[PDB]
């Protein structure tokens, strides 16, 4: 059905009423989202049906209809924007300057914005308007505030 480039809500009816479990990005006819959101399950778009194509539980990423398409990266200097799509609320761009996640395999950016679980999979944009990652997989620090990583997948 709807293959339009843009940010989408991932919804379910298995629970009470309509519930937003996550968010995702559609680009080049491919839907990109965090793995913990769908658990690799098939999606529906009107009478159309999206099937998983690629996935990885460690990276916490999953693409539908095709391979991963998002490839822009944070330059480690500039301010980025989180395109937050909260459950039952309008999409709201929140400009922030990312932090750092020092891991044994290298550093990756981190957005320190606090949102409900149903917001997982919200794109993080650069100044041109390119998706440099997905917000939704991170850790809770000392003062209870949430810090998500800037999760990006590998293009082929």
């Amino acid at each position: 059905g709807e293959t339009t480039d843009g940010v989408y809500r991932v919804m379910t009816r298995r629970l009470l009423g309509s519930t937003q479990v996550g968010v995702g990005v559609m680009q080049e006819g491919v839907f990109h989202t965090m793995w913990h959101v769908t658990k690799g399950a098939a999606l529906r778009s009107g009478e159309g049906r999206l099937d998983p194509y690629w996935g990885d539980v460690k990276q916490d990423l999953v693409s539908y209809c095709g391979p991963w398409k998002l490839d822009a990266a944070w330059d480690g200097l500039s301010e980025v924007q989180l395109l937050a799509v909260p459950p039952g609320e309008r999409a709201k761009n929140i400009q922030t300057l990312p932090g750092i996640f020092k891991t044994k395999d290298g550093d990756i950016g981190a957005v320190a914005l606090d949102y409900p679980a149903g917001t997982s999979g919200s794109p993080i944009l650069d100044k041109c308007g390119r998706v440099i990652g997905l917000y939704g997989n991170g850790v809770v620090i000392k003062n209870g505030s949430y810090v998500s990583a800037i999760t990006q997948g590998k293009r082929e």
Partner: protein, 39 residues
């Protein structure tokens, strides 16, 4: 069964809410895709 609904365009909005800090955290990623603090 899950389903998708469009929510907007992917555009940078000039003059948007500038908030949030930039912390340097030492973290660890496990086989299950979960992050954890390292101290």
């Amino acid at each position: 069964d899950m389903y998708i609904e469009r929510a907007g365009d992917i555009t940078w909005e000039k003059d948007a809410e500038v908030t949030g800090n930039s912390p340097r955290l030492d973290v660890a990623l496990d086989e299950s895709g979960d992050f954890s603090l390292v101290e």
